[PDB]
Design a binder for this molecule. Sequence first.
Ligand SMILES: Nc1ncnc2c1ncn2[C@@H]1O[C@H](COP(=O)(O)OP(=O)(O)OP(=O)(O)O)[C@@H](O)[C@H]1O
Ligand SMILES: Nc1ncnc2c1ncn2[C@@H]1O[C@H](COP(=O)(O)OP(=O)(O)O)[C@@H](O)[C@H]1O
Ligand SMILES: [Mg+2]
Ligand SMILES: [Mg+2]
Lengths: 281, 70, 210, 277, 177, 365, 52, 105
Amino acid sequence: LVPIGRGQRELIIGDRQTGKTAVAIDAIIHQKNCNEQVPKAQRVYCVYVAVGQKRSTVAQLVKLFTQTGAMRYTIMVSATASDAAPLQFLAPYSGCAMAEYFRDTGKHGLIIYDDLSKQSVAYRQMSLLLRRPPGREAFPGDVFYLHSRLLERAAKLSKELGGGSLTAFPVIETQAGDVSAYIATNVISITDGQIFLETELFYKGIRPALNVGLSVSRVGSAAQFPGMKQVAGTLKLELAQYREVAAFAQFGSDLDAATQYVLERGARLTEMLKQKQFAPI
Amino acid sequence: VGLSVSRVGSAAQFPGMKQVAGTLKLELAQYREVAAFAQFGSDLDAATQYVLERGARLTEMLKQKQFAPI
Amino acid sequence: DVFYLHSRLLERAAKLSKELGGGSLTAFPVIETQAGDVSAYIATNVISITDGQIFLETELFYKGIRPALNVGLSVSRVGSAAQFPGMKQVAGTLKLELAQYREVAAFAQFGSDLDAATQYVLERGARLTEMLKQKQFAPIPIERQTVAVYAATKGFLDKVRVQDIVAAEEAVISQVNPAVFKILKANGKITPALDAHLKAELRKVKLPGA
Amino acid sequence: SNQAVKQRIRAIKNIGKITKAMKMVAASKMKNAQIAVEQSRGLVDPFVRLFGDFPAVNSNKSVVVAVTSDKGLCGGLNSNITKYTRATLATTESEGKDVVVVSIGDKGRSQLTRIESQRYQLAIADTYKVRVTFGQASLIVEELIKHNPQSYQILFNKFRSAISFKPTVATILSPDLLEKQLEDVTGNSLDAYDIEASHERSDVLRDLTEFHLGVTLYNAMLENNCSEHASRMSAMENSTKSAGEMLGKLTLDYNRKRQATITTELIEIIAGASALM
Amino acid sequence: EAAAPAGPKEFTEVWNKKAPSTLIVPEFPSNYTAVKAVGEGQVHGDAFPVNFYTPHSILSQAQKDTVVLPGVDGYFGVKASHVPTIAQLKPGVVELHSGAESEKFFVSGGFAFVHPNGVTDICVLEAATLDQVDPAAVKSALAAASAAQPTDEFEQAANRAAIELYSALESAVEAKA
Amino acid sequence: EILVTGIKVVDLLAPYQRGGKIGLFGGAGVGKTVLIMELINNVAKAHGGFSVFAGVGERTREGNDLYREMIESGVIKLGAERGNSKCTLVYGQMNEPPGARARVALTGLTVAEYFRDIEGQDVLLFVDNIFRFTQANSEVSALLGRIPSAVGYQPTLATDLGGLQERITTTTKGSITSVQAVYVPADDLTDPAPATTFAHLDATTVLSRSIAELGIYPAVDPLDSTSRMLNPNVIGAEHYNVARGVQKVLQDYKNLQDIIAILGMDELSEEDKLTVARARKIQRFLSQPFQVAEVFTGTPGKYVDLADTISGFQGVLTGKYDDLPEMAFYMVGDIKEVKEKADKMAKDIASRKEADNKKVSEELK
Amino acid sequence: SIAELGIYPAVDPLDSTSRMLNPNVIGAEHYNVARGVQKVLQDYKNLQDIIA
Amino acid sequence: ALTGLTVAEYFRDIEGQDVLLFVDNIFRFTQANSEVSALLGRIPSAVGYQPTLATDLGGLQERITTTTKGSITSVQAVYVPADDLTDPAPATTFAHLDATTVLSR
Ligand SMILES: Nc1ncnc2c1ncn2[C@@H]1O[C@H](COP(=O)(O)OP(=O)(O)OP(=O)(O)O)[C@@H](O)[C@H]1O
Ligand SMILES: Nc1ncnc2c1ncn2[C@@H]1O[C@H](COP(=O)(O)OP(=O)(O)O)[C@@H](O)[C@H]1O
Ligand SMILES: [Mg+2]
Ligand SMILES: [Mg+2]
């Protein structure tokens, strides 16, 4: 539904404990499964930047990337919560520089900035203690330039420069599904796509809790699988029809034997897009 | 019409227009109270349907056409 | 530091140990709330300082239920099992019956479907919430409250309908022989001899609802 | 998140005017369909003072009808009839008697199948779309006569007033299949009357019970329609109450969010200005 | 032979055993009628209660002194303490009299009962006053009704009812008083 | 590895880790001190290590209550038996100045970190209101000449809180199971101090006031309480499937509640009526009497084993207990007691009289 | 809202204005069809809260 | 409003009368004192008001009382800002009010 090309930056935005990291860990583990099958030139080397997290949270990911085997291709840049505020502000740039090595020398990179919303809090702390005057919520004026300097480094290079690529997955945590925040509306404006994960879809069983009505991909049908370009065009065409009819039929007024078809078919597709935790298909 | 007022009011109205606007605004107040129920046409009420029909008449009266003042 | 303002104030309300004299200090902070918003800043500050709350509602106060005590929200956990023993023997049934009255008023805010056992808990709850409401500037001693809620959480008032309960409890306080108030004050609780004399004395009471 | 609350106030306020419209619609339909209900109430009386009222009779075959509403905002009317369906359908059960259950109205088609699915045979629906006429009740009586039981049961709501609709079971027995067999005491009570038919008494009762079924079915589905409209008028009365108390809670919480928005934007502006001066 | 003596009272007693007890007894059509057949009285001399009914109307319920009913043997009349009767009516004129004044309803047929207590319940489907029929369309329709004569005894029985109702309407409209 | 707490909603929906940071999130009067006391009573006796209770910014009356009840149950021993004590108390209660309440959590951490690093064994650290640490540094930070951050807080909220929280871990040489009560300032879970401390915990049990106002205690929001242990490779697929099915039923009822409040339950589907009935039963079944609440509720408390929790909630999910009413599930231990209370409520539907004569309270008894 | 329906270009017909929408600029046959299309799309939105 | 108060306090304290004071729009008194508090560079309190809102209102309203000489009875028109009674200017005014007379259309 929201396919991702190489060189595209895609925001994984969601509320507090949705499946945001689990979407990004599955993108990294899956590159291990593809790197064994592709030739050496089109292998994707992943970098996971862990900003402001626990140190034992990232120790659970090194243990997961080891026992899957993705740590052969993975760099982890870990600026935990006990690190200084300039080490968490600068760790997305350090991870982007470690991943720009593969972009600049003709290979392919995958950078994941887990909680850019925790990098901007580390940036706000230095800016308020360097006595730079605060703006919205307290943030510095240049906090759009903070993230657009960083996400614009994810590019698909020309073939003169090697044809290399760097694909970004910034993660932004919202508060109550409020994407109208300051840092949220900045990164929505920077990145191409958006994977919006909803906490109410999470508990209905739909995991990955992807809001299919709000999740975009600006590259779109340009860089998806051609075998699923001709199948998932019909899939989003039906799930768009599922959404408005279920708003009416939960009142329980009346049903129409083809309105009955679209909320019975869209339930086949909603259960189809569910998935387990660490098994990329 | 519900939110537009004049604290001077009808003391500075054209007399003759004051003869007819005083019942025009009452008819439009009754129409605004029974408004948004005009989608119930098959579900007719025969006392509020008259003020609903006349309110739909009178809102079509006060429309104008852009730099043709009357 | 507006939490610290009230916390360092109310923490001085203590009960001292016997090595410090055994003195006490009971605090009643009062917080005005805007439109019932208990989730305000200063309100939730003082709620997390004090040992309980007494919630007084505008919807009970406008109806004349005065004091307008929100029984589902009011709480006092440190004073519980430290109250009057006769009142503790009587009032658990009162808290439970007002709880079930709140349940069946939470189910039926409009009256058309009557189970006739739900009508019983409705009539008992309406009797008890007429019992607990009182007038201003006249506090009652605890034995005259114990006997008054003893006469209500039991029978003895179902003859009286819903209006004359304010006169019924005054008739009960007046016509009960005032020795049983002295025994209830002195003993601390209703002894079974006193329960016998109290069941006896609540039968020769001339209720105004007749 | 401050615009989610404003659009939720928008939703609750439009719901609260929709339900206030439907309350007045149901009240309008209740008065101009009560002028047809107590007109048809008279003709049920000669058949009950001629044939009597025999609900608990040991029928071999029985067709029970629960006539319910078509539209669904009636508010627990059809469910009350669905429960009195089994409450009066278990009081027939004395010897293992056959029962056919039949529902008039779309909201009885969905509700009897949860409780009695093997004994369901027919769904009459779209009956109150234009109006209720006696030829219509005659055709429904015809299709209830295609299979020919010994008794008929009609369950509906008797429109007493706009407040009470205490439900009714009306019973119609096949002509001498059980009806005159329920009449013979030291002789009979039907033998007082001089049958002035063309053919025998066994055919005048055959015509007379089909006419009684048509009259009872017509009055049942007319009284049920008027009690449906009054039940909807009382159901959308509580809906505007709920959509007003929810609106008032949402308006109070919006006022809190408005005040907090002005305070937080002001504290941001003051902190920006104080870091320069 | 009548070993199941039912009623509202027996159904009340048995229904308190198999239904849940909180459910009030379902009402019965007996509970809205104060008038029965075996309940003696309601006579008072010369005028008797005539319950002229209709599915879509109640045309009369006050007491009248003589009713001319168009039974299938022929027109008969009902005075006050008449014999009990269950009379099927052919399409004819039900005459209600209160004295010199007569209101003439031409009905479509349908039964008319006289009970032991002197109450009479005329029960017909379409019961028009004879004022509101035109004398033109009846022979205009009977000319076609005397033409389509098929072997289909459903349609032929409908034609028989058609020519008989139309003939009775004609013979009642030429014979006005 | 799981930490069994004997609490139905905690063990079912957000199970605790034996070396994990656990947070209890609440809004002034929803029950996180009562939950932290019940967790003390259930966990800190089977767990054979040492305990540290760091009281930060709470009532002095509650510190005296916990101290006296620990002397009673022998967890704390006085005099020459002092070496057989199991708990050590560090107190910075709400009468202290802001500098004292800003450092007392570090004192309790130091006492816990000695037992973790030097004695090399498992510690239980209970911190009542780690929010008061952040609030105390926010009182202090105004007078230090700092530009304030969001809502009113210090610019260093995340880093002060993270520097305190990253010390509270289990290392390779010892364990600290941490339970922190977290206060939410105006029932505002988006306030920067709760929103910052959400990312430091392995299991976040969020207590709601709307759950508490329905009488359901512990007032745990089941659709807001999470764990890293709710993972089928960690707890087993039986537990995980029961927990996710319970959450699916509760979320479906939450989506229906806006319709039910307006149009009533008469407008629902029969499928919707089934899920509303089942969800009301599993809402009441998540409530539980506490042993520490019985001194003011009067109902004795129940420790519900985890196997009983899984089996009972699976039975209420599949529809094995649709025969029982809603209030049979309210404030009972396990599914044996639902059927016991459902027999008893039904039994008391008749027995309401015959206290007429034959008394022991006539004049000469 | 227009984009989630799949109507592309997702131009809000009511909210999009121009100064070229006078009848003395673009003629009356253009002006009255544009205003009629807007009126039909507006009272559809007033009905849409009751269709749902 | 203080000038009107002084004229009323002369009739109370020297003439010994039951004076009537009419503060026309007490909310505009609040709004004016909020403006002079904003212009003197003070940090505004809640929603936007002066930090001294309760005392700048109570300094006016506490001079309206009954003395032993006479009294001042004040009839103050009250405007409620966003039809919001929990706004701090009417919530501070309503603490001082002893009666409301709502005039209805
Ligand atoms: N596709 C999935 N299927 C089942 N469970 C899932 C899935 N994705 C995530 N989960 C569960 O949801 C919980 C939260 O996942 P995750 O760690 O991704 O949250 P998050 O969005 O990263 O929030 P935070 O950054 O606060 O941890 C995890 O414990 C995981 O077990
Ligand atoms: N499990 C429970 N059973 C009964 N009452 C409870 C329970 N939990 C909380 N309460 C009630 O909630 C009140 C506040 O709980 P407490 O933990 O003291 O508040 P806080 O969450 O502010 O620390 C208690 O006084 C108690 O009455
Ligand atoms: Mg994460
Ligand atoms: Mg506490």
